[PDB]
Write a protein that binds this ligand. Structure first.
Ligand SMILES: C[S@@+](CCC(N)C(=O)[O-])C[C@@H]1OC(n2cnc3c(N)ncnc32)C(O)[C@@H]1O
Length: 371
């Protein structure tokens, strides 16, 4: 059992297969949540699957959250959670039947249980829930949508890019109830599928969603959504769903808005609405800068890219399109400059190193990239 530090938190992690899971590479993902929570200010928050407890501990130490819940089904994780919490906080941790509570400046609740059972007990209780599972979050989604306030925030992660990026089509249909698209656009389609499944599951509770921030990074998808209260809110949310058509011979895509597609070879359903709230993401860049984070340089690099990134469905991948059409292409920076000079919005995208988001028609893009 060695000690490590992440952000303002110091935790004990076992040494190697490990009894309690901890991934230092996820320090960035945790930094982004911290930044967002300092903008939204949720009071009651839940770290549904905390393992070592690092996420919830940082929520308590680095954000305005007043009541923080840490939960894990593993006995080992639970014991480690209590230890690391008391490693960062003073006081006596009162425990009773797989539940330990500390009532200090911040109220910390440590629970040993199935996330679905805990969330079912806390109906319409949390202002913010963070679902960070090992793989798919689908077995916890429906209950999280009932555990969060009707105007709460949901932070969702999916680490199984295989089905979301199209490698495992069958699994994607089973888990996400959507037809995935392979290729250069898969990182974004996977992200829009995640957001779209959250929107679809939310509808039955007469709730809609506004995406605060949804992105892809190092083989995992993240979606922060704000629940909207009302049947009409839910109707308008479903109206933002749609499908994608992809011509594998050219890289040209088409979009169809609607609950159901009306042509063959449709991919989706996917969320065709905004993948970010401009104002909030803009504020996150500033907030990240004024905060001490675990991976501050990587967090700013990602947030700045997303901040300047055009918020529009899909993009054109210079490399992939070049390979499909069998043509030579210009460099990305040369293409963006050329597109802007012609009056079209054009930016790079975090979804791909060679991707370009632009309002320009496919044909205009092709004429511009042709070298
Ligand atoms: C990759 S880890 C989570 C990490 C994290 N939240 C962070 O930033 O370190 C997911 C894990 O979820 C678990 N788990 C699996 N099923 C669960 C369930 N039904 N309820 C609560 N926890 C569960 C674990 O035992 C384990 O600690």
């Amino acid at each position: 059992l060695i000690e490590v530090q992440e952000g303002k938190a110091k935790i004990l992690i076992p040494k190697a297969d490990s009894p309690v899971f901890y991934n230092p590479r996820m320090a960035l993902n945790r930094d982004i949540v911290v930044v967002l929570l300092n903008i939204l200010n949720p009071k009651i928050v839940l770290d549904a699957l905390s393992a070592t407890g690092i996420r919830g501990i940082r929520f308590a130490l680095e954000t305005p959250a007043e009541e923080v819940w840490l939960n894990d089904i593993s006995e080992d994780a639970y014991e480690l959670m209590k230890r690391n919490v008391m490693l960062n906080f003073d006081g006596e941790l009162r425990e009773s039947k797989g539940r330990a509570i500390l009532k200090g400046e911040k109220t910390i609740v440590i629970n040993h249980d199935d996330a679905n059972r805990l969330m079912a007990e806390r109906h319409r209780y949390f202002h913010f829930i963070d679902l960070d599972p090992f793989g798919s979050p689908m077995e916890f989604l429906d209950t999280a949508l009932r555990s969060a306030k009707r105007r709460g925030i949901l932070g969702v992660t999916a680490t199984d890019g295989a089905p979301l990026c199209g490698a495992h089509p069958r699994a994607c249909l089973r888990k996400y109830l959507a037809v995935p698209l392979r290729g250069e656009l898969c990182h974004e389609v996977g992200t829009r599928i995640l957001v779209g499944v959250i929107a679809r599951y939310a509808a039955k509770y007469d709730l809609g969603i506004d995406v605060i921030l949804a992105y892809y990074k190092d083989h995992y998808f993240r979606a922060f959504v704000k629940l909207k209260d009302g049947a009409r809110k839910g109707d308008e949310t479903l109206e933002k769903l749609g499908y994608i058509y992809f011509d594998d011979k050219t890289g040209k895509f088409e979009l169809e808005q609607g609950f159901l597609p009306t042509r063959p070879n449709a991919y989706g359903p996917v969320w065709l609405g905004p993948l970010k709230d401009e104002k909030i993401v803009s504020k996150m860049v500033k907030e990240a800068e004024s905060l001490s984070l675990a991976r501050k340089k990587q967090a700013l690099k990602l947030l700045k890219m997303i901040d300047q990134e055009l918020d529009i469905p899909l993009f054109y991948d210079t490399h992939a399109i070049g390979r499909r059409l069998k043509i030579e292409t210009k460099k990305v920076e040369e293409i963006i400059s050329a597109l802007r000079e012609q009056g079209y919005e054009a930016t790079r995208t975090h979804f791909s190193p060679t991707g370009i988001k632009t309002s320009a028609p496919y044909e205009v893009f092709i004429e511009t990239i042709k070298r």
